Amino acid sequence: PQITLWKRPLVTIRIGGQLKEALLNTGADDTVLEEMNLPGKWKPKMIGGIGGFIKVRQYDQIPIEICGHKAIGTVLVGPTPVNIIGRNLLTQIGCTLNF
Amino acid sequence: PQITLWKRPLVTIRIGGQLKEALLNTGADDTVLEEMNLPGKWKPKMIGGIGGFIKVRQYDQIPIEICGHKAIGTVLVGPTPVNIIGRNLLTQIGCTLNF
């Protein structure tokens, strides 16, 4: 698709069996999901935002489907207000910014 | 141009006569620049995301140039970690997400 930016660029994702809404976010290095119980090994990490830092759980090699596109990547789980798909996964789905 | 997302999507902007680098951020509703002097009236505002909120100065109807494209719109100034071009200006320059 070509997604205009008059509204937030929200898409449906599927992760750990669950459907969720998430924001396609060119301003995020990483993909950050709201608190959820995901199985698997994880490592603690601190990530920065506009207001300061949050602690997240880093899960590697996680299958995730973004607006119909299958991907496998790192997912961070922690207290973000909104699920965000960052550049690590945007690149896997072939996303570009055009103007 | 069509900008891939292997690296942060940083572009040159001109604001208030000065040249700066900024991040094209589809995950931001609005545009916020690092502390600087700008001419004009402003009002205080809170903005936020990961990590909570910061207090900014909101300037309305400010001319800005983004990678060679002129736009006019609301520019926020405050202690953001990086200069951020949000949707309010991305739309002005015809920016879309494509995959």
Binding site: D29, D30, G49 | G27, A28, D30, G48, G49
Partner: peptide, 10 residues
């Protein structure tokens, strides 16, 4: 609501 979801890996 919050509206600026800039995110950085340290």
């Amino acid at each position: 609501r919050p509206g600026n979801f800039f995110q950085s890996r340290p």
